[PDB]
Amino acid sequence: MDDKELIEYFKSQMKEDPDMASAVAAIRTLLEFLKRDKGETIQGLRANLTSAIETLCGVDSSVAVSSGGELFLRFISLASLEYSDYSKCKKIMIERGELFLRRISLSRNKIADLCHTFIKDGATILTHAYSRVVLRVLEAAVAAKKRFSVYVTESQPDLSGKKMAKALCHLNVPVTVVLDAAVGYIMEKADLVIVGAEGVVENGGIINKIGTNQMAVCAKAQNKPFYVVAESFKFVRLFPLNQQDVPDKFKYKAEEHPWVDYTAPSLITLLFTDLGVLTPSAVSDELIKLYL
């Protein structure tokens, strides 16, 4: 298959199901490309896969896609693969890729099960922007006969907080929507902060939607816990120091309007990943172990 077919399949897979992330679409497209490659060589296959990953990353600029592709490439090659016949090796890597795809789809439930027990009874929870994993966590919590109240932010400039509130309406939980500049005013009434993630970095910090750094600083100024929910296939190799060091291909999407910002590890309390519950110091070597 060619580049145009690649992009068409990618966009069709993304459009078919709105309840689906970019990483899974990229992985499925890469598997489809693997199942339709011809030739008798390993280096040719590697070059084709690298070119496909590059042209897929070109279309959409999100951190998870590159990490998912790299992890896919590393994972499918961790076996014997010596033999003598191309076909046997091809079937072996196809089976490995299918097993990897099966494994990926079983992390949200584990995260929800591990994280739902940290919510008290009759508590106020502040959150930011839209994230499906937080919605799953709250659904699991409300299925356990608990009560709480939720605050959200309008999340300029696309107003995703209103969509999050509308989704929260069906769960008959009290929900309030505040302005994007009233975080400091509203921090007093809150008890804990739960946010999503877009990519986990080496030193322990995170990369997320613009507007998280100020919330973290304000929460730290009043001694409130800060919780983060992330996924295994979102760990990327990068060691930023300040806000300038972030690569430009993630800052500006395809007057200044940056889209993402990075938060340091000294302003976070716990991380709830599918590997378990980790302090920020555990990521520094869990990432090393993961990228075998």
């Binding site: 060589t41 280096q43 040719g44 590697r46 490439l73 014997s80 010596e82």
Partner: protein
């Protein structure tokens, strides 16, 4: 300055043992360059990646070494060669080293001979190879060893040099260099 294949063949066959010098290390395999068949690229897949082992190494100690490897798969249209290391026996490695040394000495003496003639490019070097050494190993029906033993025997009997279609200008320099190196 000059560069030419050690043998008239362009690509090796299966079950062949060859010299190799590691060029770079990637995430799944090793990018290497061959020597007997001129500078041509190749991949060696790391069995088990030597995965725990590779974490504690400087990752650049292995750059710039030499070993013998066995070819398993060949694709001429694209130019891709599959190599392996586990499928190598030390007895075969001894002949690997010996043949490499003999071919290296023959190539060095031939290149030094051609240096006096001052070939502008390697095309004349290739013509010299097919007119002196490749024809030698074709007549002897054996690769590498035949030319070496012919040169080592000719140090005392230069008359065989006149058997081939060799000009006097080339013959003088070739005899001088053979008697210098081989002695």
């Amino acid at each position: 300055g000059l560069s030419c294949r050690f043998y008239q063949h362009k690509f090796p066959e299966v079950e062949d043992v060859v010299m190799v010098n590691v060029r770079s290390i990637a995430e799944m395999g090793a990018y290497v360059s061959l020597l007997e068949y001129n500078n041509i690229e190749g991949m060696i897949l790391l069995s088990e990646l030597s995965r725990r082992r590779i974490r504690s190494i400087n990752k650049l100690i292995r750059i710039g070494r030499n070993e013998c490897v066995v070819v398993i798969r060949v694709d001429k249209e694209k130019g891709y060669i599959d190599l392996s290391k586990r499928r190598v026996s030390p007895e075969e490695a001894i002949k690997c080293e010996d043949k490499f040394t003999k071919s290296k000495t023959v190539y060095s003496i031939l290149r030094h001979v051609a240096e006096v003639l001052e070939y502008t490019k390697d095309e004349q070097l290739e013509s010299l190879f097919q007119r002196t050494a490749w024809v030698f190993d074709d007549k002897y029906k054996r690769p590498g060893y035949g030319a070496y033993d012919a040169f080592k025997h000719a140090v005392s009997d230069p008359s065989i040099l006149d058997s081939l279609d060799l000009n006097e200008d080339e013959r003088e320099v070739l005899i001088n260099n053979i008697n210098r190196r081989l002695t």
